[PDB]
Design an enzyme around this catalytic site. Structure first.
Site, PDB file in Angstrom:
ATOM      1  N   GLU A  61      61.440  79.125  14.204  1.00  0.00           N
ATOM      2  CA  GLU A  61      60.044  78.650  14.225  1.00  0.00           C
ATOM      3  C   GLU A  61      59.132  79.589  15.073  1.00  0.00           C
ATOM      4  O   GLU A  61      57.991  79.881  14.671  1.00  0.00           O
ATOM      5  CB  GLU A  61      59.927  77.214  14.712  1.00  0.00           C
ATOM      6  CG  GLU A  61      58.469  76.728  14.706  1.00  0.00           C
ATOM      7  CD  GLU A  61      58.344  75.257  14.964  1.00  0.00           C
ATOM      8  OE1 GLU A  61      59.391  74.640  14.965  1.00  0.00           O
ATOM      9  OE2 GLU A  61      57.237  74.716  15.302  1.00  0.00           O
ATOM     10  N   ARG A 100      57.331  64.618  21.905  1.00  0.00           N
ATOM     11  CA  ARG A 100      58.108  63.912  20.890  1.00  0.00           C
ATOM     12  C   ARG A 100      59.189  63.080  21.552  1.00  0.00           C
ATOM     13  O   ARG A 100      59.443  61.990  21.121  1.00  0.00           O
ATOM     14  CB  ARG A 100      58.818  64.888  19.921  1.00  0.00           C
ATOM     15  CG  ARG A 100      59.495  64.201  18.746  1.00  0.00           C
ATOM     16  CD  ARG A 100      59.756  65.139  17.587  1.00  0.00           C
ATOM     17  NE  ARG A 100      58.585  65.431  16.725  1.00  0.00           N
ATOM     18  CZ  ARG A 100      58.086  64.615  15.812  1.00  0.00           C
ATOM     19  NH1 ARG A 100      58.638  63.422  15.572  1.00  0.00           N
ATOM     20  NH2 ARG A 100      57.015  64.994  15.122  1.00  0.00           N
ATOM     21  N   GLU A 148      64.976  66.104   9.701  1.00  0.00           N
ATOM     22  CA  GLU A 148      65.342  65.783  11.051  1.00  0.00           C
ATOM     23  C   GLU A 148      65.831  64.353  11.392  1.00  0.00           C
ATOM     24  O   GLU A 148      66.671  64.239  12.264  1.00  0.00           O
ATOM     25  CB  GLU A 148      64.197  66.108  11.989  1.00  0.00           C
ATOM     26  CG  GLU A 148      63.739  67.547  11.962  1.00  0.00           C
ATOM     27  CD  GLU A 148      62.434  67.704  12.726  1.00  0.00           C
ATOM     28  OE1 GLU A 148      61.342  67.327  12.194  1.00  0.00           O
ATOM     29  OE2 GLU A 148      62.524  68.210  13.874  1.00  0.00           O
TER      30      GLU A 148
END
Ligand SMILES: Cc1cc2nc3c(=O)[nH]c(=O)nc-3n(C[C@H](O)[C@H](O)[C@H](O)COP(=O)(O)OP(=O)(O)OC[C@H]3O[C@@H](n4cnc5c(N)ncnc54)[C@H](O)[C@@H]3O)c2cc1C
Ligand SMILES: O=c1[nH]c(=O)c2[nH]c(=O)[nH]c2[nH]1
Ligand code: FES
Ligand code: FES
Ligand SMILES: [Ca+2]
Lengths: 1289, 48, 49, 49
Positions: A776, A854, A1235
């Protein structure tokens, strides 16, 4: 001037100047251009480089076939052999059945491991055209796959063996195998089999290789040049050369010598020439064990038991027994067995011969033996066991250090005949010292004793004293290793009891308590059972509409065939250079000086690049706090200081070794604790708070407090980071081909480094062999360095990282430390919760902050908690910067929740599933962050899972197993999850596409998403075909590029099908609008007529498409706004069985029910569930990274970092996608899938925890009730928690 | 950062064209170019 | 792109006639930004069909 | 003016790149009665016709 002559896929190769350092993998890829065979590790553990070898075996007189690791085979070892690669068996125009089956069965996702797996299966079938299920599984011990969860590979290949929902594939449609159509053995090789073998010599840049034809030649050579290094299989030497920097300028290979390869059956045992491969050892001892009296084969079985979990077929087919013996590794699994059985070794030099008996003197020191420098090992006689003589062998599983600290043992007893009294006793160990040792002081003391509790106790006291380890001994795990020596003797003790039983001395020794019997069982498999359930599409749905159908990954056939192109498969330009990174060997220091003087002497050296060479800006990274190249100061071990450029990769590597760098250490902040103490953090505390904490804790019947540590994780994408940058010479223009999930950031970072506008830089991605978050951002560290080299030289430049480099440099999942306090009622209802989270971010900010958010957004997991407070701090340390990894903070947060939840249930004395269920949210509730839960399918997932897993009935069996077994225990747990879908940064929720229709009617589509094995392109084609109403066959996606769709978000957050799918759909709706008038005139005439009519009416057939997720944006100040567009839900139930004596465990069964909405493709979505679950499984149970106290990563490859293997997956593995649950706000009512399932593997973690609790009630005495289990729950941690007479003292 | 697309296609077709040889009607051209040139030469009558 | 630079392409090919030059001049008037901010690299069937 | 501008043949060759040469008619209108490739096959580096 000897030519090397061999065959590759049937074609003759004549190499006139073979270099001994050249591996077959390099030769295949770089000399012959056959890039189906891949590099995934370079050390024999992954099997991505597996190929088959055929030859005429002169000793058995016939053609033989075996698999090998191409990465470790010196081409100089391959004279007169025939190599077969993936390309030699079939291709997309005529697939071999092995290729067809793995493709069609959804066994290939990213595709990078597919060729090597195909070759392992293919070789198996050339040897056994009708294998068993068991043989099929054993074929892959040496092959790793990070994406699939292995189930579909074994299920597809099971079709070669045992000789409501639709189905995921149809075996009846598979073409049958015809062995007559395999490639001919090269007739030339059969001609040459006749002529005698001549000694050969090969001379390379640094190394001379002699292939000795005769014993005489080998002995003369070693007499005259004792320095000549024997190489047989190269499975040790290759590693020393490639990774330990070692260079043996003279090498002799004796593999051809008849006397080194013989098997002779004599009166005391079986003699094996020292060069016999372990695979021949195995097949001979197997057959001896099958045909002989049990009483004679006790030693043979101990050897077989060690060879079982040893390496793959690939390694064993060339690794020699003599090589293992002479390598003398302290963790040899074989030498303890040979030592314990007093195996007979013959040694020779020119005019000398002697026999010895392996004992403690055979190994006098670290990696040393009794051999003189001129002697070689001729043979080892492995002995028959005598009447009254018994043998066991044992092996720690788990391995953390290159060389040390894994326990392995051989144990032998001889009884005076007709008695229970000891005549001889030998207990030998590896992994307890710097060499294989004998408990020489303990065993003498038991001579003439009777086999009884007194002897057990005596030997355990002796072992503890004689093998005692200092708190600081090399390798750590000192408490576990101690416990294993004792525990392994216990098993041996119990086993001998049994074996005396079978010799009718039960009355002298006693019966074994039947609750102890399971302690001594050898590991038994149990046949796999799998079920995959999903939903049929409507009966009315057109057959050409593939949305919701299990369409195979569009590249699966090419991936099975080795024709799919990954970055390093791209051919080199004639003027292309190679780059090698030079990284810091200190965690925090000043660079005092750099000397390149040795580097400049390496042939082909071009330059060393450093910060001074950067044209514009040295500041890079997502938050602009990273160097392209270190300037003045290094801040982790792995910090990139510079880059060597040279003509070839070998010259780049050797030149990088001549960059000598000089440091002055500075104060280093390594651990989370170090950071807390030094106030070293990225930004301020993040916080979510709801209700009244003081009141909740005041109202709570109970309060429990604790901590939890969660280890990090390496992505271990099978394809490492790679970039090719190609300078165009005009206007600063450059094109880059990169394995990255983030074309945009790659483009931006390259453009800023160079000081050119973004419009000059194009980034292209065809596909990645996995990414998982790892690519990423952290791929740009290689990309920018290569772009710079290309800019400087005006030439194309390429870098693909070696596994050790990639593991060092690119970082991983964030380790977490949590401090929690939970308040709850007697009923199990929780009323209050406070958790402090800390993460280890390493030396750059990267995505660390969003990861913490998160984790905080998921600290509830599935549970409504009226009074709640979470904080997180992100620690700034001198380690490689950690980054995204599938889950992105969610799994860490939710494991902490389930961890305190496990304690709430035990404290209440209530069934954990009841406690979870009654705390679960319901439809309409608000989360702690005030998002409302609509379309809350979690209870449906829960009830289906409970029912289809038969949870309650299995609970009762687990309880019973545990009451009837003292030294094994079962555990069972069911875990739910809620996972928010959308990037935590709102504006990243956007995507675009571009579509063209050509005048033949064919459609070229592209979008911002990159393919990394998740089947994104497949899904987009499915979507486009439905949107356009034409078959998928007319639609193609070739690649992802910044010059077709700009400004794209990374392929991450599980969001890419949702976002790109809407972009695609809109692009398609624009084209349909413009074709409408032509449709009306010609409502029947085909698509191709509408297209051609529009073209000739001058209507545009090209369109862009774009989507933004609406109504997103959470505020941390006001705790309002939606951070997520919708949530994923799922439940898993898992069962385990632990070995209380060893720490090892079996994953008996897992059942998952997953809400993927109306799946776009249930084949791909089930594959993502299984893939994700298995990565979770590694995270919570197997995968453990280890660092020096000065912040240096030790665990850099698969020999030390253990990802799940074929044999790790749940034996019964069931997956169902929830029926009738459209999610109409995402594309065609689907949900993202990548995920959310990962965290469900915590089910295995908690089941292990239940099992430990039962072990503790069995043998603990006063045991602490809320005992500690950090993640990962490895054999060390499980074993050490099973307190007993062996752990205590 | 407001999630607005910054990519666009563009297209154009010249309108109103189309000649028929059968009816000697319809415009083949969108417009005409015009120019004029004056040139002076000197020849060698004996060599060309 | 997010740095404000513009990558443009069109169906036409450059053969010495200064088509790209003219296209950039056109785009720069149209967009009201300097020609320095606009680039054309190439002509390709996968950007304009 | 600098020779930096890249035309098709200026593009670097791949290491595995091959070269092609067309074979054309020496007759205005004729039947092809046979093609003999035996001498072409002897030229080092010949791949295929
Ligand atoms: C993926 C992988 C997994 C492995 N797993 C295990 C495991 O689980 N347990 C375990 O114990 N080992 C393990 N090994 C080690 C493996 O068994 C040894 O590498 C192997 O047996 C060495 O044999 P070789 O023929 O490849 O030796 P080479 O590497 O060719 O030689 C190794 C050493 O032996 C010497 N040598 C070889 N033959 C003779 C001779 N006749 N006389 C004198 N010296 C000689 C060489 O000079 C050299 O020093 C593993 C290795 C790999 C690559
Ligand atoms: O909210 C997320 N943002 C990301 O950047 C990312 N990356 C990832 O793997 N998962 C997520 N989730
Ligand atoms: S690359 Fe050869 S085993 Fe991994
Ligand atoms: S499909 Fe096996 S590593 Fe990706
Ligand atoms: Ca970081």
């Amino acid at each position: 001037a000897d030519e090397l002559v061999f065959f590759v896929n049937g074609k003759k190769v004549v190499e006139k100047n073979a270099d001994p350092e050249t591996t077959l993998l390099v030769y295949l890829r770089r000399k012959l251009g056959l890039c189906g065979t891949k590099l995934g590790c370079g050390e024999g553990g992954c099997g991505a480089c597996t190929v088959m070898i055929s030859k005429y075996d002169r000793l058995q007189n016939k053609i033989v076939h075996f698999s090998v690791n191409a990465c470790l085979a010196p081409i100089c070892s391959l004279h007169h052999v025939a190599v077969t690669t993936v390309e030699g068996i079939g291709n997309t125009q005529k697939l071999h059945p092995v290729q067809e089956r793995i493709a069609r069965s959804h066994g290939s996702q990213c595709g990078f491991c597919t060729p090597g797996i195909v070759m392992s299966m293919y070789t198996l079938l050339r040897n056994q055209p009708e294998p068993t299920v068991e043989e099929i599984e054993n074929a892959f011990q040496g092959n790793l796959c990070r994406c699939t969860g292995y189930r579909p590979i074994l299920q597809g290949f099971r079709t070669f063996a045992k000789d409501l929902s639709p189905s995921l594939f149809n075996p009846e449609d598979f073409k049958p195998l015809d062995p007559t159509q395999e490639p001919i053995f090269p007739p030339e090789l059969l001609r040459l089999k006749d002529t005698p073998q001549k000694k050969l010599r090969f001379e390379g840049e640094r190394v001379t290789w002699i292939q000795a034809s005769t014993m005489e030649e080998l002995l003369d050579l070693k007499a005259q040049h004792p320095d000549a290094k024997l190489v047989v299989g190269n499975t040790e030497i290759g590693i020393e050369m490639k990774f330990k920097n070692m260079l043996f300028p003279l090498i002799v290979c004796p593999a051809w010598i008849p006397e080194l390869n013989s098997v002779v059956h004599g009166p005391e045992g079986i003699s094996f020439g020292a060069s016999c491969p372990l695979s021949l050892v195995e097949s001979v001892l197997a057959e001896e064990i099958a045909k002989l009296p049990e009483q004679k084969t006790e030693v043979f079985r101990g050897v077989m038991e060690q060879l079982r979990w040893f390496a793959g077929k690939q390694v064993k087919s060339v690794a020699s027994i003599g090589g293992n013996i002479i390598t003398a590794s302290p963790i040899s699994d074989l030498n303890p067995v040979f030592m314990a059985s007093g195996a007979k070794l013959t040694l020779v030099s020119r005019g000398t011969r002697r026999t010895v008996r392996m004992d403690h003197t055979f190994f006098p020191g670290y990696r040393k033996t009794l051999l003189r420098p001129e002697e070689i090992l001729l043979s080892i006689e492995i002995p028959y066991s005598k009447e009254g003589e018994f043998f066991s062998a044992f092996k720690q599983a788990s391995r953390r250090e290159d060389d040390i600290a894994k326990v392995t043992s051989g144990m032998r007893v001889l009884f005076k005949p007709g008695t229970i009294e000891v005549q001889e006793l030998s207990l030998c160990f590896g992994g307890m010292a710097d060499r294989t040792i004998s408990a020489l002081k303990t065993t003498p003391k038991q001579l003439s004793k009777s086999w009884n509790e007194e002897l057990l106790q005596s030997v355990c006291a002796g072992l503890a004293e004689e093998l005692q380890l200092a708190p600081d001994a090399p390798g750590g795990m000192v408490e576990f290793r101690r416990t294993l020596t004792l525990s392994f003797f216990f098993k041996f003790y119990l086993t001998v009891l049994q074996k005396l039983g079978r010799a009718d001395l039960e009355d002298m020794c006693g019966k074994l308590d039947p609750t102890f019997a399971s302690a001594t069982l050898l590991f038994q498999k149990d046949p796999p059972a799998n079920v995959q359930l999903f939903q049929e599409v409507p009966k009315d749905q057109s057959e050409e509409d593939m949305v919701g159908r299990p369409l195979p990954h569009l590249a699966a056939n090419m991936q099975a065939s080795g024709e799919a192109v990954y970055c390093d498969d791209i051919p080199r330009y004639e003027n292309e250079l190679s780059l090698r990174l030079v990284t810091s060997t200190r965690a925090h220091a000043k660079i005092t000086s750099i000397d390149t003087s040795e580097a400049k002497k390496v042939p082909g050296f071009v330059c060393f690049l450093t910060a001074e060479d950067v044209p514009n800006s040295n500041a890079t990274g997502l938050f602009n706090d990273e160097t392209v190249f270190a300037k003045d100061e290094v801040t982790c071990v792995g910090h990139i200081i510079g880059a060597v450029v040279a003509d070839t990769p070998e010259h780049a590597q050797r030149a990088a070794r001549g960059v000598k760098i000089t440091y002055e250490d500075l104060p280093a902040i390594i651990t989370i604790q170090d950071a807390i103490n030094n106030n070293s953090f990225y930004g301020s505390e993040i916080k979510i708070e709801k209700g009244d904490l003081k009141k909740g804790f005041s109202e709570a019947d109970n309060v429990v407090s604790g901590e939890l540590y969660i280890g990090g994780q390496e992505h271990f994408y099978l394809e490492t980071n790679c970039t090719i940058a190609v300078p165009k010479g005009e206007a600063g223009e450059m094109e880059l081909f990169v394995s990255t999930q983030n074309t945009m950031k790659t483009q931006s970072f390259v453009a800023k480094m160079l000081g050119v506008p973004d419009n000059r830089i194009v980034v292209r991605v065809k596909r990645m062999g996995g990414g998982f978050g790892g690519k990423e951002t952290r791929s740009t560290v290689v990309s920018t360095a290569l772009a710079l080299a290309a800019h400087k030289t005006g030439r194309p430049v390429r870098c693909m990282l070696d596994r050790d480099e990639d593991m060092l440099i690119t970082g991983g999942r964030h380790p977490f430390l949590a401090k929690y306090k939970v308040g709850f009622m007697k009923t199990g209802t929780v009323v209050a919760l406070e958790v402090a989270h800390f993460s280890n971010g390493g030396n750059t900010e990267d995505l660390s902050r969003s990861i913490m958010e998160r984790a905080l957004f998921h600290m509830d997991n599935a549970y409504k908690i009226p009074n709640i407070r979470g904080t997180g701090r992100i620690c700034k340390t001198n380690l490689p910067s950690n980054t995204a990894f599938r889950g992105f903070g969610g799994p860490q947060g939710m494991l902490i929740a389930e961890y305190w939840m496990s304690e709430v249930a035990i404290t209440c004395g209530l069934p954990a599933e009841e406690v979870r269920r009654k705390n679960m949210y319901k439809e309409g509730d608000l989360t702690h962050f005030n998002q409302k839960l609509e379309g809350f399918t979690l209870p449906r997932c829960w009830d289906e899972c409970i029912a289809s897993s038969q949870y309650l009935a299995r609970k009762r069996e687990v309880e019973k197993f545990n009451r009837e077994n003292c030294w094994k225990k079962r555990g069972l747990c069911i875990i739910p999850t809620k996972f928010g879908i959308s990037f935590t940064l709102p504006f990243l929720n956007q995507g675009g596409a571009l579509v063209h229709v050509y005048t033949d009617g064919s459609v070229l589509l592209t979008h911002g998403g990159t393919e990394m094995g998740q089947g994104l392109h497949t899904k987009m084609v499915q979507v486009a075909s439905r949107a356009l109403k034409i078959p998928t066959s007319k639609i193609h996606i070739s690649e992802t590029s910044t010059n077709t769709v700009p400004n794209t978000s990374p392929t991450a957050a599980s969001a890419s099908a949702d976002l790109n799918g809407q972009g695609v759909y809109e692009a398609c709706q624009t084209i349909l609008k413009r074709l409408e008038p032509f449709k009306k005139k010609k409502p029947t005439g085909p698509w191709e007529a509408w297209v051609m009519d529009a073209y000739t009416s001058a209507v545009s057939l090209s369109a862009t498409g774009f989507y933004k997720t609406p109504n997103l944006g959470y505020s941390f100040e006001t705790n309002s706004g939606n951070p997520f567009h919708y949530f994923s839900y799922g439940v898993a139930c898992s069962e385990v069985e632990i070995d209380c004596l060893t720490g090892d465990h079996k994953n008996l069964r897992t059942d998952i029910v997953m809400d993927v909405g109306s799946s776009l493709n249930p084949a791909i979505d089930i594959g993502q569930v299984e893939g994700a679950f298995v990565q979770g499984l590694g995270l919570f149970t197997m995968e453990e990274l280890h660092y020096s106290p000065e912040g240096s990563l030790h665990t850099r490859g698969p020999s030390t970092y253990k990802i799940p293997a074929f044999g790790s997956i749940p034996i019964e593995f069931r997956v169902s996608l929830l029926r009738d649950c459209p999610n109409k706000r995402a594309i065609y009512a689907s949900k993202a899938v990548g995920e959310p399932p990962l965290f469900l593997a915590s089910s295995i973690f908690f089941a292990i925890k239940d099992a430990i609790r039962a072990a503790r009630a069995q043998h603990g005495d006063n045991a602490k009730q809320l005992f500690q289990l950090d993640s990962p729950a490895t054999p060390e941690k499980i074993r050490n928690a099973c307190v007993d007479q062996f752990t205590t003292l």
